[PDB]
Design a protein around this ligand. Structure first.
Ligand SMILES: CC(=O)N[C@H]1[C@H]([C@H](O)[C@H](O)COC(C)=O)O[C@@](O[C@H](CO)[C@@H](O)[C@@H]2O[C@@](O)(C(=O)O)C[C@H](O)[C@H]2NC(C)=O)(C(=O)O)C[C@@H]1O
Ligand SMILES: *[C@@H]1O[C@H](CO)[C@@H](O[C@@H]2O[C@H](CO)[C@@H](O)[C@H](O)[C@H]2NC(C)=O)[C@H](O)[C@H]1NC(C)=O
Ligand SMILES: *[C@@H]1O[C@H](CO)[C@@H](O[C@@H]2O[C@H](CO)[C@@H](O)[C@H](O)[C@H]2NC(C)=O)[C@H](O)[C@H]1NC(C)=O
Ligand SMILES: *[C@@H]1O[C@H](CO)[C@@H](O[C@@H]2O[C@H](CO)[C@@H](O)[C@H](O)[C@H]2NC(C)=O)[C@H](O)[C@H]1NC(C)=O
Ligand SMILES: *[C@@H]1O[C@H](CO)[C@@H](O[C@@H]2O[C@H](CO)[C@@H](O)[C@H](O)[C@H]2NC(C)=O)[C@H](O)[C@H]1NC(C)=O
Ligand SMILES: *[C@@H]1O[C@H](CO)[C@@H](O)[C@H](O)[C@H]1NC(C)=O
Ligand SMILES: *[C@@H]1O[C@H](CO)[C@@H](O)[C@H](O)[C@H]1NC(C)=O
Ligand SMILES: *[C@@H]1O[C@H](CO)[C@@H](O)[C@H](O)[C@H]1NC(C)=O
Ligand SMILES: *[C@@H]1O[C@H](CO)[C@@H](O)[C@H](O)[C@H]1NC(C)=O
Ligand SMILES: *[C@@H]1O[C@H](CO)[C@@H](O)[C@H](O)[C@H]1NC(C)=O
Lengths: 439, 129, 96, 48, 48, 48, 96
């Protein structure tokens, strides 16, 4: 420090940067028909498998519980998106899609049931079209297993062996309806998801809270609004190229497909038997030796199912904690701006928005980003008049025109010292810069 | 097919399953596909004398012509062929004990196949501008 | 698939021998006379010659056996310009 | 030219094209790269 | 010898399945511990 | 053991996935520690 | 594990039986570098890990926020600083 002053780089210009965050809230509801997987339709295998008693009932019961937890979690996520959402019945998203120079039309699908399943936003369409095995993807894939096509879809081989993914209780179209409602709730009165005020004013007050004077924000409202809509466009254009959030969404589908393929491959393991085919055993051996070979297949396949079910329990615990985090981000980053620094993504978090994604939610975090900086000598406090101490609120004291002035900590704009930007102390601390002539 | 040379008559997958063959007598070629296998999803309400059945991902023509004919009424739902439930997807319920998937519910008074809409927006008639 | 295959990175030995009039007795000893073990993989150049612009195919004949005496069968694979004559007989194999 | 090399019972990865011709192969135990090609059942393994 | 060795293989493979299930469960707790640590870095160290 | 099929491939794949989660978690913790950290080039271990 | 020592480490027996702990992708030395950087970032300008103000002022404003008057709190600055560094020493001595 020179005198009582320190050198600090204070921003002189800024932009808004958008950052994506995919949070997995759901997973494919895998169901296994244990006796159809273990034995298919060979009566000699079903006779032996019946002697294992409750083993298949346990496998079925654990997966039914895991799937019930996924269903309960999806309802709790949907409830969180819709909580407190109040909208005007006059809202018609074909006309009503930009406000205060901020354009929302890519984030808002058609509102109300009269449009059918088309409530998916342009941004959600742009994300769901890059993932073949969405909920509707699995339904369409299974619809083709009896279509008579020459294509040997691996999902048809899996489902005929009793491995089938059931659709979630709420369609991804309904969840995009709920993210659409939660999004328009922020941009129009009563602003039920934007603290009850116009979205541009919420953006402005959030940037001001970072220590940016209101004067530069309310004169640069066009620049802030265009920086916000450019940040959103940069997020959308970012999906046309290698992207960590898109890769995370695809990794959910790829890891499920890998686990289901690995489980189907266990039907071809011999487990030390003469063949993995029950037809080959039953066409080579008599009942007493065939039983010895079939029992090896039953033990291997039941062990494979037990290993798969144990892994599935472990993986859905991560999905439950991921959904809990997504709900916390909806409540503390989207519907409100909780005073937690790196919770809603990195940097100077302004505000966050949410959109539906295959098996999760895409959060868009908007952050205040310094473009350029001025090195300046700052005082963290002043000692004034009758040795009264003053500390700057969210800012710094600055010598400008050889006079003591205040600047916000996130934007260099010298303004006069006043009770609006000061914390008073009845005695000043040691090392506070002596300024007897102030106020 | 054109892939069978003079010494070849069997087509195998990477797992060693027979998936096609050239008939030695007629030289005609056939692909072999697994016979259909699957599960019926039965929705049951304690107050009912019967079940609503969903043949997931199957059209009703397939169920009736290739699985089993039946006297029960039926229709092709988005989820597959539904038996013994009335198609009422234009109706909706906010609570559902028989959740079928993709926003569909089976509701019992007959059974009704209906949309599951657990959450709605609180609407107000106030001006938007 | 598990089968009778070459070792990748192993060496091929060119065992073909072309003579004009003289035959060396060393051509009929190790390392040319070789142990068969499980088997061998052969890569053979079809030496395409021409007589009055008419193409003729020639390549080295291979014999497979044990002692090469008429009390035992010797497999012989010999080319005849587009015909591959394969025989397994109790041949009185020559010394050279 | 009559090139010969010994045969032995060996596991190979065999790649068949859409017309059933063996276009490529890998001697699994011949080298460390061959071992990764056979483990991943691929002629060009992923970076890893 | 195959009959005795197969008993060793089933025992040792069962032991690996049990260990892998244990390790999956333990790493889930480590991930939640790391999430709490990151939250304390952000909300107790870098800010209050 | 080769006649048991993919059992060892599955054990390796689950441990590789679990270890990949530990690696990803360690990177996220380090990222959290370094997030927003700005230091003067004038800092020295022996004087400050 | 390749050493000639008579004392066989149980970890060597484990690794010869295929059980081995691999090192983490970032060394504990690198993480110690990151915790060191995150710590010095609190005490010197620009104080990027301490709300952009001197560490002692952040301590003072944090204690004031509990309902302690700034008057007693800024005259007792050395008592607060020595109490803070004594608390840190008590943590270090706690590992003994
Ligand atoms: C395995 C091997 O080493 N194979 C080579 C062969 C022998 O080393 C040689 O036979 C051994 O001889 C012993 C065992 O004593 O030599 C060849 O080359 C010859 C010169 O070395 C060749 O030019 C011949 O030259 C003449 O002077 C002569 O009689 O040797 C006149 C004859 O008309 C002419 N042949 C023709 C026109 O093809 C050949 O063929 O025979 C090329 C072969 O690749
Ligand atoms: C202030 O009110 C005016 C309307 O009086 C708004 O101006 C409209 O803004 C949209 C962009 O969002 C333009 O496409 C329209 O052409 C504008 N209409 C008119 C009549 O100018 C303006 O957005 C409001 N907000 C701010 C911050 O200026
Ligand atoms: C099935 O195809 C084979 C060839 O792949 C046919 O066999 C050839 O038939 C012709 C005409 O009689 C003969 O000249 C060839 O010598 C046969 N070749 C062999 C390898 O047998 C066979 O005739 C066909 N059969 C039918 C009913 O079409
Ligand atoms: C399901 O049953 C119907 C009715 O029996 C089958 O219909 C046959 O379809 C083939 C062409 O695919 C026609 O050549 C036959 O004339 C049809 N009728 C009969 C009586 O066979 C149908 O093939 C069956 N299975 C499937 C997979 O659709
Ligand atoms: C189930 O009932 C619904 C509601 O009546 C049917 O959907 C309507 O079908 C008519 C005639 O095809 C269309 O004009 C409407 O536009 C549809 N409305 C909606 C909301 O889609 C549906 O087709 C019936 N399903 C079956 C298999 O009969
Ligand atoms: C801020 O930065 C942008 C982009 O470089 C530039 O267009 C604008 O003129 C700058 N404004 C100020 C006040 O420096
Ligand atoms: C289902 O089959 C139809 C007709 O072949 C095709 O257009 C469609 O893309 C297929 N969808 C899936 C997911 O297999
Ligand atoms: C089922 O019957 C009970 C009485 O036995 C009644 O309380 C309940 O409301 C009925 N539910 C329906 C859906 O009919
Ligand atoms: C949704 O609308 C229906 C209309 O009948 C109503 O019964 C229900 O209470 C509304 N709200 C919820 C949360 O279901
Ligand atoms: C809103 O609804 C109330 C109650 O029916 C009615 O008194 C009021 O006039 C309505 N306002 C508009 C703008 O339709």
């Amino acid at each position: 420090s020179v005198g009582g002053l320190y050198e600090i780089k204070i921003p002189t210009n800024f932009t808004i940067v958008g950052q994506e965050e995919f949070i997995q809230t759901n997973s494919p509801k895998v169901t296994i028909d244990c006796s159809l997987f273990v034995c298919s339709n060979y009566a000699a295998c079903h006779d032996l498998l019946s002697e294992y008693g409750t083993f298949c009932d346990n496998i079925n019961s654990i997966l039914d519980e895991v799937n019930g937890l996924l269903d309960t979690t999806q309802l709790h996520v949907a409830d969180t998106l819709m909580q407190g959402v109040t909208l005007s019945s006059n809202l018609n998203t074909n006309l009503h899609f930009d406000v205060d120079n901020i354009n929302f039309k890519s984030l808002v699908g058609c509102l109300g049931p009269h449009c059918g399943s088309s409530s998916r936003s342009f941004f959600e369409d742009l994300l769901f079209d890059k993932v073949k095995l969405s909920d509707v993807g699995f339904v369409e894939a299974y619809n083709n297993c009896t279509g008579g096509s020459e294509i040997r879809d691996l999902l048809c081989v899996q489902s005929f062996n009793g491995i089938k993914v059931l659709p979630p209780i709420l369609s991804e179209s309904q969840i995009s309806g709920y993210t659409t409602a939660a999004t328009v709730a922020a941009m129009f009165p009563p602003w039920s998801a934007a603290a009850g005020i116009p979205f541009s004013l919420n953006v402005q007050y959030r940037i001001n809270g970072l220590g940016v004077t209101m004067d530069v924000l309310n004169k640069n409202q066009k620049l802030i609004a265009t920086a916000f809509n450019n940040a959103l466009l940069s997020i959308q254009n970012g999906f046309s190229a290698p992207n960590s959030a898109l890769a995370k969404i695809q990794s959910v589908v790829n890891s499920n497909a890998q686990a289901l393929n690995s489980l189907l491959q266990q039907l071809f393991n011999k487990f030390g038997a003469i063949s993995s085919s029950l037809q080959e055993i039953l066409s080579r051996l008599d009942p007493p030796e065939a039983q010895v070979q079939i029992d090896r297949l039953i033990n291997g396949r039941l062990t494979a199912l037990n290993a798969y079910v144990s892994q599935q329990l472990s993986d859905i615990s991560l999905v439950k904690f991921g959904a809990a985090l997504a709900m916390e981000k909806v409540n503390e980053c989207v519907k409100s701006q909780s005073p937690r620094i790196n919770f809603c993504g990195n940097g100077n978090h302004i505000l966050s928005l949410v959109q539906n994604a295959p098996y999760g939610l895409l959060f868009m975090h908007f952050s205040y980003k310094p473009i350029s900086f001025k090195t300046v000598l700052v005082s963290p406090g002043l000692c004034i008049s009758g040795d009264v101490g003053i500390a700057p609120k969210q800012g710094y004291f600055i010598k400008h025109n050889d006079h003591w002035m205040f600047t916000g900590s996130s934007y260099y704009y010298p303004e006069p010292i006043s009770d609006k930007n000061v914390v008073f102390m009845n005695t000043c601390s040691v090392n506070f810069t002596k300024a007897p002539l102030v106020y | 097919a054109v892939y069978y040379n003079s010494w070849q008559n069997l087509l195998y997958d990477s797992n060693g399953n027979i998936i096609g063959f050239k008939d030695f007598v007629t030289n005609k070629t056939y692909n072999i596909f697994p016979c259909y296998a699957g599960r019926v999803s039965a929705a049951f309400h304690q107050n009912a004398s019967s079940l609503a059945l969903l043949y997931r991902n199957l059209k009703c023509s397939y169920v009736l012509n290739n699985i089993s004919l039946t006297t029960q009424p039926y229709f092709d739902s988005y989820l597959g062929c539904v038996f013994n439930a009335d198609n009422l997807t234009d109706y909706s319920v906010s609570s559902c004990a028989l959740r079928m998937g993709s926003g569909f519910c089976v509701d019992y008074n007959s059974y009704r196949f209906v949309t599951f809409e657990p959450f709605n927006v609180s609407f107000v008639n106030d001006s938007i501008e | 698939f598990t089968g009778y295959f070459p070792k990748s990175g192993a060496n091929f030995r060119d065992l073909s021998l072309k003579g004009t009039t003289y035959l060396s007795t060393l051509w009929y000893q190790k390392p040319f006379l070789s142990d068969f073990n499980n088997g061998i993989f052969s890569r053979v150049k079809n030496t395409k010659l021409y007589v009055n612009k008419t193409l003729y195919s020639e390549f080295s004949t291979i014999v497979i056996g044990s002692v090469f005496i008429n009390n035992s069968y010797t497999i012989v694979v010999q080319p005849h310009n587009g015909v591959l004559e394969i025989t397994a007989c109790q041949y009185t194999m020559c010394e050279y | 030219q009559y090139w010969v090399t010994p045969l032995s019972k060996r596991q190979y990865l065999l790649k068949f094209d859409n017309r059933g011709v063996i276009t490529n192969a890998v001697d699994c135990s011949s080298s460390f790269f061959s071992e990764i090609q056979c483990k991943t059942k691929s002629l060009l393994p992923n970076t890893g």
